[PDB]
Each structure stands twice: as structure tokens, then as C-alpha cells.
């Protein structure tokens, strides 16, 4: 299995990019998970409103 280390590094770069992107938008996920915490359901309308 010589093809088990390419996919690991591909997912590693994907995770690194996702972390670097989520760091800048940390407030977005913060207010979003708080909104999910108070209001027990979360649709696309509340989703796009909370994207502000």
C-alpha cells in the first residue's frame, strides 16, 4: 500500500486550510452556535441572517 500517505497529506492540507479559514471567521461560528443554543432549530434563513 504505497497510496496510503498521499491521501493523508491531502486531508492534512484540507484541514490546515479549513482551520486557517475558520480562524478568521471565528466570530461567525461563535454567534452561530450560540443561536443554535438558544433557538433549538436553525434553518437557512436564520443561517444567512447570522452570516452578517
Amino acid at each position: 500500500l504505497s497510496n496510503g500517505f498521499f491521501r493523508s497529506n491531502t486531508r492534512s492540507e484540507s484541514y490546515q486550510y479549513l482551520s486557517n479559514l475558520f480562524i478568521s471567521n471565528g466570530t461567525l461560528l461563535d454567534r452561530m452556535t450560540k443561536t443554535l443554543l438558544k433557538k433549538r432549530w436553525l434553518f437557512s434563513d436564520e443561517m444567512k441572517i447570522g452570516f452578517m
Partner: peptide
């Protein structure tokens, strides 16, 4: 009480009244 019904769809669970036919 405790349920799994979203607050947006609560008002949709009631029956509205209706005006009687005014003309007769």
C-alpha cells in the same frame, strides 16, 4: 412543556376563525 416543535411553526398549529357569510 417540552417538545420538538420549532417556534416558527407554532402558529401554524391553530385553527383560524371565519366570518359568517354577510349577504343573506
Amino acid at each position: 412543556r417540552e417538545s420538538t416543535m420549532p417556534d416558527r411553526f407554532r402558529y401554524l398549529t391553530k385553527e383560524a376563525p371565519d366570518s359568517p357569510i354577510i349577504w343573506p
